């Protein structure tokens, strides 16, 4: 079962509120959306992340949550640990795509 469909093409980018989405790939081999959290995993927002990666596009924005140091640095386009050390890589896209409201 698949779907899809193209014809329109939107290059003047006017009036189209795109939100771009932060992921991270995991152990397991999915990438996983950086969701809120204050005490269970407590985490950074899709939002903080991102935020940074705007001034410093080519940096890196170290914090400290879940009883644990982490660290992302944008320029090597993947997350570095310290807790544990584990590496995972990154990547920057829209949440939605394509007019087609819903």
Not at 33 to 50: A, G, H, K, R
Request: with cysteine.
């Amino acid at each position: 079962g698949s779907s899809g469909s193209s014809g329109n093409e939107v290059d003047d980018m006017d009036t189209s509120d795109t939100q771009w989405g932060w992921f991270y790939l995991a152990e397991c081999g999915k990438w996983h959306m950086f969701q809120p959290d204050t005490n269970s995993q407590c985490s950074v927002s899709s939002e903080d992340i991102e935020k940074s990666f705007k001034t410093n596009p080519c940096g890196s924005i170290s914090f400290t949550t879940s009883k644990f140091s982490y660290k992302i640095d944008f320029a090597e386009m993947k997350q570095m640990n310290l807790t544990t050390g584990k590496q995972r890589l990154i990547k920057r896209a829209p949440f939605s795509s394509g007019p087609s409201s819903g």
